[PDB]
Design a binder for this molecule. Structure first.
Ligand SMILES: c1ccc([C@@H]2CO2)cc1
Ligand SMILES: c1ccc([C@@H]2CO2)cc1
Ligand SMILES: c1ccc([C@@H]2CO2)cc1
Ligand SMILES: c1ccc([C@@H]2CO2)cc1
Ligand SMILES: [Cl-]
Ligand SMILES: [Cl-]
Ligand SMILES: [Cl-]
Ligand SMILES: [Cl-]
Lengths: 252, 252, 252, 252
């Protein structure tokens, strides 16, 4: 079928797009860099199996894909945002508006555009790549963290109205997901090379390692395959058992 | 100590103000209607034990109460919004921004304004009046429900950084809370008068009744008293057992 | 690899066994009816791709499958119990012990038996089939519901220590899962035939239908494939959107 | 009114009994040591405001108090158990049966005995002192941790059926609660004296300190006062913001 994967170059985009592609889906890909013809084409050249789009806005995109490839059957809103860690009083109120717009508004807009067609054919799948930070908050990241929670809940609420139209909605909240070259949010350097970061990951996750893109993709391809729609409304914590709680003094 | 209760005429406003005032607090009150001196003075006249302020913006309000009454020890962000129920595709993206602006950005702006003074004294209490809908989502209220979840998570995330300064932070998510003459969100008419509504409330809640403003007020006063700061980060579901799940055919 | 599916004739048993077998696994199956050679051989004859065992106790079973098929890589603790709905005061304390013995002690006994061999190879997968009732409790089913919550938490707690040995642990809490000829817990009669029951299911679930054994089987096979071990600790709610919350009077 | 507080000498018993007493309640107290006349009397001597009972079993106790003081209006099942930290394969299946019996069966039995009288007068309050470990599991404590979760869920499920009879049920799950002289589970020595333990607590809780008995008591007296019954079914995490998640390398 036809699927859309946003910000394909960062976070969980590549594992998603690629695995969905492997699963024989037509995968239209969105990303900021697809504004410049050089970047888009460089992309379509390197990945002949992915269909990169230039459209940037939600509605514009949905339409581009609907026309170009018939319709949108799967939506993987892979949302990102570059947050600053800061005491609440040191943030600017616009620093929160940025986070909310990038992590909550964007996916809402996306579902607000493709929603009618899926409901009309009574079929489709919706997936949000959010974050596992709401499950175990770090201090001084209130903006990013709270916005992610809104997205998780958005997904669950939507599963309630779209179930009637046979449309599953899921939220996958990762943490410590190897983003490889992308800086969102766990690039090979330093997470896989610098001893300190390697030891941190080792300590805070139960599996003692970063999550791989293939694992994320396998989940997305599985959910979008229609093999287990009864899971609609589920928030998946892709965080290798994180967080590992520190134990009492004297314990290994 | 000095407390601030926003949108005092609606939602949890009166219960919070009155019970906080009966506890001994100096309660500065905010509300949109107070932009008019006629309203502010009428309110002031009916409630001599409350201090209605005309300030509307976060920074201005905190500063105004800090001047008049020395400081702000307790902040009760009684946030409200009038959402429409609607299929995700029938909403306008602006209908989500609006909801997020009033239910998330607003409480964030207020804490972002009072946070520094509390951290300096290393004392204070922050309480968000959110909603219990995230716990049991209804279909077609995706903007208002997810916005509330952002607020709850904001409170918990904030509890992590402010705890170092001995500042508790809580979220009280109500549902079926009698708002008396206020339309936010369960006014006496028709919730305590109309048989259809009375029946509904009787079915969906365990205690089979609306919550009272006195219960919400007691909880707010208790949390801000310092009797139990160890609860910091807690999300309180004030909904009398809601949601009661419908049982199998043949059962009473 | 070798998998063990308990109580294979009931609950999630068949879906798990069949789909696990279609994936390539050697599926040793347990069941109470297999204490009788007549039953074990009849089952063996109908399902030549399944390996029905007669062992009943945890230690004996793990040992028996370890001998016959080399080892145990995947454990699917498909636990069942026939609880009565009743006011807490109408239950007998023994009615809780019984429930806890079959829904908690049993899965614990099994993992306690296979844990060492998996930790030595540093490979394996543990999956508990629990229940989604903890998420949306019904009144008068306090023994069965709380026992299931113990099972879920057991799975997550176990995911923390076993992750170091590269052993994922999951819990799949189903609800409204078609159990076909099995009485545990939604048999074809009357759940797919009686209009009263068909209506109920249509109201309380988002997808408005029973879950299928194929969906539960797909999920079990996916989790045990190694495609996404980073999900370790996850509690999967397999209930098609349940619980759908009853809306305000006047709404459709 | 008349209230019962079990294991009054350990965990949250003293803060509960005493504060309830201060609140002008007749407080019958249970404890193992109240088997020997020497211990009971020593207790009744030291605390003339508390009424210690010798009865040990649930039913025997409820009856003793009902007769002696008219009826039981408040039940505070303060449950304890001395667990061993151990890899799952190193536990004995009876080590789990112990935990379950002490942490799940006991409170169930207690509510199973006093339940009918509360439902008949359509009034009463039920409180479980459980544990916050299910919210943030440590590795190798699967027994204690999973059983606590069962108790938390028991409480929530009971809130559903007893709400109809106007009986609130709550669960208070502490962690790092100063148990003073009692070894259950954070005695002054070493938690308040040995630098290592003091630094641990400082690190894993947001408030950076143990929770006090007075805080626990204030909550119990507040819930049992009938000031906020609309909170029925709530699980209160009394853990000063625990757990504090470890942040990225380089961060303070
Ligand atoms: C900062 C940004 C993003 C994360 C992971 C995806 O949530 C963690 C810290
Ligand atoms: C609509 C708006 C608000 C509510 C209660 C407070 O959350 C319910 C329906
Ligand atoms: C009774 C027993 C079991 C269920 C489903 C599996 O949890 C529902 C009612
Ligand atoms: C062991 C036993 C009890 C605890 C606290 C109360 O839960 C922690 C470790
Ligand atoms: Cl991540
Ligand atoms: Cl409300
Ligand atoms: Cl089921
Ligand atoms: Cl504790």
């Amino acid at each position: 079928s036809t699927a859309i994967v946003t910000n394909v170059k960062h976070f969980g985009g590549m594992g998603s797009a690629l695995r969905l592609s492997e699963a024989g889906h037509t995968v239209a890909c969105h990303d900021e860099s697809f504004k410049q013809k050089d970047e888009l084409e460089a992309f379509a050249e390197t990945y002949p199996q992915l269909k990169p789009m230039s459209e940037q806005e939600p509605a514009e995109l949905i339409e581009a894909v609907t026309s170009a490839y018939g319709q949108v059957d799967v939506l993987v809103s892979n949302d990102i945002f570059a947050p600053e860690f800061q005491p609440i009083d040191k943030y600017a109120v616009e620093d929160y508006r940025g986070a909310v717009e990038a992590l909550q508004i964007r996916p809402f807009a996306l579902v607000n555009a493709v929603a009618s067609q899926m409901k009309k054919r009574k079929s489709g799948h919706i997936i949000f790549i959010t974050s596992a930070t709401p499950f175990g908050p770090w201090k001084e990241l209130s903006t990013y963290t709270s916005a992610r929670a809104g997205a998780c809940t958005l997904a669950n609420a939507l599963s309630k109205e779209l179930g009637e139209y046979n449309i599953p909605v899921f939220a996958i909240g990762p943490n410590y997901l190897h983003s490889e070259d992308s800086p969102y949010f766990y690039p090979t350097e330093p997470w896989k090379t610098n001893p300190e970061h390697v030891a941190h990951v080792k300590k805070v996750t139960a599996l003692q390692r970063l999550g791989t893109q293939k694992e994320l993709g396998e989940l997305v391809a599985f959910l979008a395959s229609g093999s287990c729609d009864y899971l609609t409304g589920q928030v998946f914590w892709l965080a290798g058992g994180f967080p590992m709680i520190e134990r009492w003094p004297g314990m290994p």
